[PDB]
Amino acid sequence: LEAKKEENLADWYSQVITKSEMIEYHDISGCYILRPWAYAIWEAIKDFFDAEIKKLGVENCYFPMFVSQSALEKEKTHVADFAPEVAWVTRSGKTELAEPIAIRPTSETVMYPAYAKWVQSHRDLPIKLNQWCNVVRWEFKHPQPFLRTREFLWQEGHSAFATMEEAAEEVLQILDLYAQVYEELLAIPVVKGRKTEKEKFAGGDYTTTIEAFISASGRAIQGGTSHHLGQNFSKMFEIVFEDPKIPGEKQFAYQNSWGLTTRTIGVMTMVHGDNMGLVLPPRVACVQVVIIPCGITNALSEEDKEALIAKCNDYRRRLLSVNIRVRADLRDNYSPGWKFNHWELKGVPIRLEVGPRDMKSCQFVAVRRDTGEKLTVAENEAETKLQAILEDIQVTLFTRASEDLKTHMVVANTMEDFQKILDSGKIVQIPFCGEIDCEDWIKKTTAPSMGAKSLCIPFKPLCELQPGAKCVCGKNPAKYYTLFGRSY
Amino acid sequence: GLEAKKEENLADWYSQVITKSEMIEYHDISGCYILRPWAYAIWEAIKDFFDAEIKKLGVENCYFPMFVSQSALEKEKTHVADFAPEVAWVTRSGKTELAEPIAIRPTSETVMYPAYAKWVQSHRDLPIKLNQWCNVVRWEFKHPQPFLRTREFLWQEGHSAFATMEEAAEEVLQILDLYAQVYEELLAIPVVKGRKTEKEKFAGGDYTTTIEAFISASGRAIQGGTSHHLGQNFSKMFEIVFEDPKIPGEKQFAYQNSWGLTTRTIGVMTMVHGDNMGLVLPPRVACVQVVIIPCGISEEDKEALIAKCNDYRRRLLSVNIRVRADLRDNYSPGWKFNHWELKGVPIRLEVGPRDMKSCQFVAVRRDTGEKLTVAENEAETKLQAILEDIQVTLFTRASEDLKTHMVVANTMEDFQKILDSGKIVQIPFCGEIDCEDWIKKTTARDSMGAKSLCIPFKPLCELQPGAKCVCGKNPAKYYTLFGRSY
Ligand SMILES: COc1cncc(-c2cc(F)cc(CNC(=O)c3cc(N4CC[C@@](C#N)(C5CC5)C4=O)cc(C)n3)c2)c1
Ligand SMILES: COc1cncc(-c2cc(F)cc(CNC(=O)c3cc(N4CC[C@@](C#N)(C5CC5)C4=O)cc(C)n3)c2)c1
Ligand code: PRO
Ligand code: PRO
Ligand SMILES: [Ca+2]
Ligand SMILES: [Ca+2]
Ligand SMILES: [Ca+2]
Ligand SMILES: [Ca+2]
Ligand SMILES: [Ca+2]
Ligand SMILES: [Ca+2]
Ligand SMILES: [Cl-]
Ligand SMILES: [Cl-]
Ligand SMILES: [Cl-]
Ligand SMILES: [Cl-]
Ligand SMILES: [Zn+2]
Ligand SMILES: [Zn+2]
């Protein structure tokens, strides 16, 4: 690793994600290879989220990757938003197809004709379905690995309810699960909010979101999203059922959709990584502990070296007995300093050093990757202390990022205050009228050199909006404190 | 209740059963089908078994892009020539024509191997063992059939690269018996391990191994899983080369395998075990292993009954038996019987008021319909017993069929007779592509011709020395399994 994270964030990021062997570049731009080191993180997130939504009654399934032209168009706001980046398959071989078919940018228009077929009565609701699949949004803007890509992996959940209340309840349950993914799995603090009218999902009624802050770049990013679509899709696809209390009254299903993508890993990189490379939260780390033999003096007896390799394997089995994911790196090819650096780059939480003296002093050394602190631990305590230390790394990482967010998110009540705070690389909760025209005016007059976008309306703002407060536009009364910033 | 009869109209029976069991929904684009939860759970059961197994072998999961460049797509010529007609091309985003068309993967050799070339520099960088669960597209214009032959399907594809040929060779057989376990221990389907002929092998591979299942209802056989030794065919083309100090200055080409298994599995399960009442789920893969159904339906009597049902539910979740209590009051018991029979749940546990008061219940096996009265005591015992017995039963009934329908013939006269019987045939075979073409042509001439299925590792007989191929002109190389196929 050669570029410094605070000097050039993009070069740093690219260096870190490739040299940790998370990402390989592919010869089609905006498409990247998820190598096992990153895919294992996606799999940990999947293990957690899948079990949680199972408890909520959601079931997994798989819908086709192709959308017909007429299905894609039924909900005009939604297709108006997505149409410019829909990839169209037009031949197979040199044989033109009968009709162009589109690759799913999002599966509402794939799934909801099916929903309409399956909802025949109030007993068929609710329908709670989820799929883990890939989608394509073929924008021409510059792509960025993990954060903004042309193909990405994700989950998308789609549910249909008889009543608005059960649907509004699910929206928030899911959004809290996303917050749990970011905060408990990835040790990333997030702000829960609602999108403004301009930023909400096209076709939906309201969008709830979690926002993360990346202090290196001073910019925020959406980490997850949970929409209430209301009846805007069920009216276009005729997902209908007869009202049970009133005969012949056809009702339209109330719908939500919600998605979470591999953006998660990029945020985890941008937030925790440092100038030695990746830093993996223990809860998602592929390897949690790497055992590395040191000493190896060359005047060591064959008896001594064989006994040290033995002791390393004793540690390995020890840690496996208590469910710690542990790799012993007993390769004679590379030097110990080499391996130290190699596993630091990948961000293994703990490096476990065993050397001939500590080996017979009944102890070993643990090195935390987050703080760099070396600890000497007696053999006896290993699995206990190591687990206590993995816990402490998780906490420590979360805490640091929280201190970042608390320091870098502040209130401002006028446009001048706002502009200067924003220009110090912070995000700002300002009083806002909610109007698209004023949001555009903000983005215009506030131009790391782009105008601020609205990021969300927090469920729990920093200040209480005082009666009669006017927006930053000055022309209209303010409706809510809203988090604004520069954005990925 | 099911309408069509398997032995009368197999295609209609199949469509009826896959839709009414709520496995498949149709899509407005022909050739693509919706896997609903009931089918997807079977896929996920296969997924869990196979994932654990290949992990013990040192394969890791990953995810490669869906799109291939023209340059990459053509670098190995035999492979590209075989797949090009069925490759779907993206040509525009929105109303914007792309400068270069790009292709959707029909298989991911040409996505993955340019990366393999960058990762390999020394023998220490080997082996590379990567697997991906993903979707592929093969846009063929023949008529699709759900699960069996679709234009989009889910699969796993494993790709391995090794410094030496012996390691590669070992892995091909390891993966192939994993596939055989998936079929024989999970879906209760017997299969034939063998080698593809030169006409049927993976284009640009060295050799292809395969497992074939037999579908007695149609009389046809189907490939179920595939494991290819690619040799150095692709690494020479994508320059996956390494230096090893044992052989100074020689750039050495990696030895490579690829291996794949698809949702076709589920369809073969359906074709093999389904009956005229609908799907029949093997206990090992069944989403729901036992469905508890309250029968009958005062109130203290009603409430007591939903409660004893929930009692059985908690007791069965205790012992990791996958169980549903269908306590919906908006559907009658008969409706529920029919519904879960259509979905093939292995065991129906009926609780009526009389037997609730008599500390007993009734278990009904889906595969034989046989009803058994059971004490409340043995619910965790006898049920676990019965499920196990159902699994073996499905397997043994399947095997009988295979062993009755797979026979030897050593002359074309016999071969044709037995083939028209609805059976599959092992014949002495020269191995040549022309002979195989001719077997197909004349077996249709004298409603489709027979194709080579595999060359069995363990044939039914051994070839007499000096014996001739069933064509007469060339010495037979091996016994080869022929038959009509999907
Ligand atoms: C908006 O101006 C841009 C600026 N700079 C670059 C681009 C751009 C460039 C490209 F080459 C390709 C693309 C297309 N991909 C994406 O837009 C995208 C969106 C998301 N999203 C959107 C919000 C969400 C959350 N939570 C949704 C739940 C899903 C989530 O994860 C995730 C990923 C990996 N990719 C965009 C666009
Ligand atoms: C043979 O002439 C035909 C006759 N009648 C119809 C078609 C046809 C019609 C379509 F509309 C679409 C297609 C394309 N899909 C497939 O070719 C295909 C192959 C496999 N395969 C191939 C062997 C394999 C195994 N084991 C390999 C591991 C992969 C395995 O599962 C599985 C599935 C679900 N689909 C074919 C073709
Ligand atoms: O694209 C989105 O944001 C929604 C959430 C998952 C499905 N579509
Ligand atoms: O397409 C096939 O059949 C082989 C096996 C999976 C990858 N390629
Ligand atoms: Ca630069
Ligand atoms: Ca758009
Ligand atoms: Ca000591
Ligand atoms: Ca072909
Ligand atoms: Ca050869
Ligand atoms: Ca040379
Ligand atoms: Cl077409
Ligand atoms: Cl909140
Ligand atoms: Cl058929
Ligand atoms: Cl129920
Ligand atoms: Zn305003
Ligand atoms: Zn011959």
Swiss-Prot record, chain A:
Swiss-Prot/TrEMBL domain comment: The WHEP-TRS domains are involved in RNA binding.
Functional summary from the UniProt entry: Multifunctional protein which primarily functions within the aminoacyl-tRNA synthetase multienzyme complex, also known as multisynthetase complex. Within the complex it catalyzes the attachment of both L-glutamate and L-proline to their cognate tRNAs in a two-step reaction where the amino acid is first activated by ATP to form a covalent intermediate with AMP. Subsequently, the activated amino acid is transferred to the acceptor end of the cognate tRNA to form L-glutamyl-tRNA(Glu) and L-prolyl-tRNA(Pro).
Quaternary structure annotation from Swiss-Prot or TrEMBL: Homodimer. Part of the aminoacyl-tRNA synthetase multienzyme complex, also know as multisynthetase complex (MSC), that is composed of the tRNA ligases for Arg (RARS1), Asp (DARS1), Gln (QARS1), Ile (IARS1), Leu (LARS1), Lys (KARS1), Met (MARS1) the bifunctional ligase for Glu and Pro (EPRS1) and the auxiliary subunits AIMP1/p43, AIMP2/p38 and EEF1E1/p18. Forms a linear complex that contains MARS1, EEF1E1, EPRS1 and AIMP2 that is at the core of the multisubunit complex. Interacts with TARS3. Interacts with DUS2L. Component of the GAIT complex which is composed of EPRS1, RPL13A and GAPDH.
Chain spans, region Proline--tRNA ligase: 1-488
PTM sites of type Omega-N-methylarginine: R137
Stated consequence of mutating F82W: No effect on prolyl-tRNA ligase activity. Decreases inhibition by halofuginone
Source superkingdom: Eukaryota
Outcome reported for the amino acid change (mutating P145S): In HLD15; uncertain significance
Record-given protein name: Bifunctional glutamate/proline--tRNA ligase
Binding site for Zn(2+): C433, C438, C471, C473
Modified-residue entries (Phosphoserine), positions: S335
Residues involved in Mg(2+) binding: Q222
Location in the cell: Cytoplasm, Cytosol; Membrane
Full-protein interval shown: 1016 to 1512 of 1512
Family (UniProt): In the N-terminal section; belongs to the class-I aminoacyl-tRNA synthetase family. Glutamate--tRNA ligase type 2 subfamily. In the C-terminal section; belongs to the class-II aminoacyl-tRNA synthetase family.
Annotated phenotype, changing F82A: Almost complete loss of prolyl-tRNA ligase activity
